[PDB]
Subunit: 295 residues, 4 copies
């Protein structure tokens, strides 16, 4: 046998960091879950019980904590880059670092009108994430995303004119519910190293903000021909609003809500135009993915 591929490291490192403006007295907190996996000349640790090549997962956990103390942890794209550059610059036999960051929401609380200086609320389970791959002599590839953004519109969603054969039972509809959890990824042009990443830093928040803003607006205003048609509109708006983005990716569940025929009981009318009460369906669910780049 032989080692064809190998990576190893530390998953699920929970990390908190506070910033104290000792002038204003305003505190900002950040919270993330971090994973770092390394590659390189580490095959012997697998084939020959040679641990001499292993930076211990424990130590990678140390490094995450250390790097966070020594550097800003915002924006995620930058922290990832700094963390991954460390591993490949520090160790000769380590040739790639793979850094996934999941960011958790701590939104400043508004109390009696006023933004409060050090109290926070998890106002969603929506996440901002990054995948940052730092390969030696290749640069830094960054996939940014927002995920777990759960939305529902009660009308202005259609689905008609799909293929009908002897497998088809679904009725054409000109008015349905559409609900999804948004998973959106945008992939940056290759950067050459930390310097280039640092030169674009303001763009990372900007593009994230844009992605979320477009997602929410297109969803609410579009008279959806299908999930397919609506997600493509979002994607092409994002690509047009930031040229450092090479591709845009959406994975979207169709979280169906079924009409309930209630007419067997007192001729009660609750379908079509009369539909008021709906059965949310835990499963199964439609799943729709698309990758959109420039023509």
């Amino acid at each position: 046998s032989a080692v064809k591929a190998a990576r190893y490291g530390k998953d699920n490192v929970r990390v908190y960091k506070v910033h104290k403006d000792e002038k204003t007295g305003v505190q900002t907190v950040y919270e993330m879950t971090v994973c770092v996996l390394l590659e390189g000349e580490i095959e012997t640790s697998y084939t020959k019980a040679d641990n001499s090549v292993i930076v211990a997962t424990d130590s990678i956990k140390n490094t995450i904590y250390i790097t966070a103390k020594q550097n800003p942890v915002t924006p995620p794209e930058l922290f990832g880059s700094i963390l991954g550059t460390h591993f490949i610059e520090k160790y000769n036999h380590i040739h790639a670092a793979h850094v996934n960051i999941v960011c958790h929401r701590w939104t400043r609380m508004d109390i009696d009108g006023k933004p409060h200086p050090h109290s926070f609320i998890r106002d969603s389970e929506e996440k901002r994430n990054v995948q940052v791959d730092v390969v030696e002599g290749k640069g830094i590839d960054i996939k940014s995303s927002l995920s777990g953004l759960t939305v529902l519109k009660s009308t202005n969603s259609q689905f008609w004119g799909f293929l009908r054969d002897e497998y088809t039972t679904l009725k054409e509809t000109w008015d349905r519910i559409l609900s999804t959890d948004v998973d959106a990824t945008w992939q940056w042009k290759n950067f050459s190293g930390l310097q280039e990443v640092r030169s674009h830093v303001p763009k990372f928040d900007a593009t994230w903000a844009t992605a979320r803003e477009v997602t929410l607006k297109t969803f609410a205003e579009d008279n959806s021909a299908s999930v397919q048609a609506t997600m493509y509109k979002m994607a092409e708006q994002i690509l047009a609003r930031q040229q450092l983005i090479e591709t845009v990716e959406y994975s979207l569940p169709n979280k169906h809500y079924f009409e309930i025929d209630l007419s067997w009981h007192k001729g009660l009318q609750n379908t079509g135009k009369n539909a008021e009460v709906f059965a949310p369906q835990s499963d199964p669910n439609g799943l729709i993915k698309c990758t959109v780049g420039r023509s």
Copy 2:
């Protein structure tokens, strides 16, 4: 043997309902998970295979759906009452109905400044719930609650002067993080029936709003002596702001965040006054409950 207690019914009924103002064109959606358990003279179904006494769980699922079409599903306290009264008035041998409702958030989206007429976002996993027990010849007891409200303050939390013996290793602190998920219950005075419930309807939202408002403010403004001291302050503020509430209950995890000594590495300083990076601890967690009523 003999049947000492028995209840049965349907759990986890997912329910959606839209309201369309066909004037304005504004739609409001509601989503909940419903459980109804019945009691009465149903022992024979257990001891003698006598199914004649059983309203089928399936049918209870029907009734939930039906009741929702025939009535408003807001406020939860009212829907519960209507649903539970149905069972005990309809069936002679059914003497109590137990109705738990969990309400899901669908907050209207703000698009380009403007409230959108039919698009919604799950802007938290926080729930509003009710437990409504309708017992025949006894009235309607209602426990309302908010839950899953996750908060964190970065300072203005203390814990010193606790008992110290040969089991104690915890250091006194005059500045720590405090994070919790809020579970708050307030118990209404017994109501006599649907009429009395209907006469107070506006109070149910009001009190909920109050509970959440007090919870968030007391948490942010209080220089916490302990979780114990801070939750009692919330409870007594709620009791004072609504006389139809008999008791107030808080269950609160203490979701610890530990300091990370980083001084073994380059004499780096990250404890006490220097603390910037923290290890959120998934487990274990402190748990603190209190029931507070009037003196």
Copy 3:
């Protein structure tokens, strides 16, 4: 206001312990999640910021770990008792200790026929649990249970002759699937203290074994008239097989599996006697509880 009820302590303490027979070289591992909540004269910690009355949750976490080192952690009923007695005997102002233990399965692996001396497998997510309430001057109440025991029979389950009214749509069936997760609790006679608990120790495993054995057999052999009828049979068999048990409790979901009419497509026959393919329904689910004691 005033404190009506109060308890506090530590939840979700994960605990592992190995036993090494240094004779045979056979190791036995145990793993549990532990919660201890205390009561007593602790109101002032809530009303007056008086922390002097508080055994710190941290210290309760210490005590769990310590008690486990100093004592056997099997059987759960005994460990609970020892742990809870500690708190009420140690502290004057602590008058009750509430101890929930959840036990995790580590079943010895069979390798090449032979029981292996120190390798284990989680061969189910089924748990053995205890609730042990130690109240000062009142003794020790113990609720033992098994839970998360998930079963399914493909036939020999019936449900006919239930009430039919204008809410009923469910068809009578003389052959259906029955699936559930078993939650079974048996409540011991009050014990006077640790001595009495120690005098019965062998009974705790025995009764657990019995409960599981009866549960599985009655489920498999009974031609079920209903969940109601089948669970009562289990309960009365357990009560008859151990006189130190005062009551037996079952909570059981009915995890429905629906027939799929496939006759719209090539007159394919998949209902009634022809039924081969079924839709497992995540929700909603029937829920059936019973408490059975002696006549």
Copy 4:
């Protein structure tokens, strides 16, 4: 813009099927969760609101159910192939079908010694899975796996001689606990179509059985130099026992259990050779992956 990649279909289709030997009266049940995603000339559904190209996700749900009635659902590798071939042979514009199956355990119950003819138990949350990609004019690629297989050995695991620098705090150990959840994938040689898949059918169970048997034995008998060294041994044993397997993949968390220094309290000794009580750590966790093919 333009569509770079696109797939769509139905996720989380829950499926049950019983087999009745009407001779013996022995029933066998099967339960799985199924996902089918299609590709082809479907870009217009995204760019031009052209639904004419879409086989509705609903219909794909039908097809899963239908295919299951018309064919055996065991072994998973075969069902996948049949299901995926259907889509690409049926529709001109559909050029690839992607079929993930997750299999759920229903192990026949042993009652009073005897295998019971129609009663079953979920005796683990361990799954057997397949990923079957059917691409038109390319054949059938199959990734089989077992997952969620959770194991722990109490000794005979070592970790020493890893790199030590100014990031390292972890102590070398010649005796620790090793716990993991096993995720093992083995990738078959490309098959040309359904015929070739059918010609190897007996091998699929065999290889699965082998994978699990090797996994469990190597884990229990190996004096682990590291997770790395132990997983490679498993992989090379599997490759040697089946030549139709091209590569073998392991993803493995290191689910750490920490020693508890209890010496601050009554000089109690619970470290090194004395260690009996351990803190299972929910997070973070070491993660170790390897892909092993033939030299």
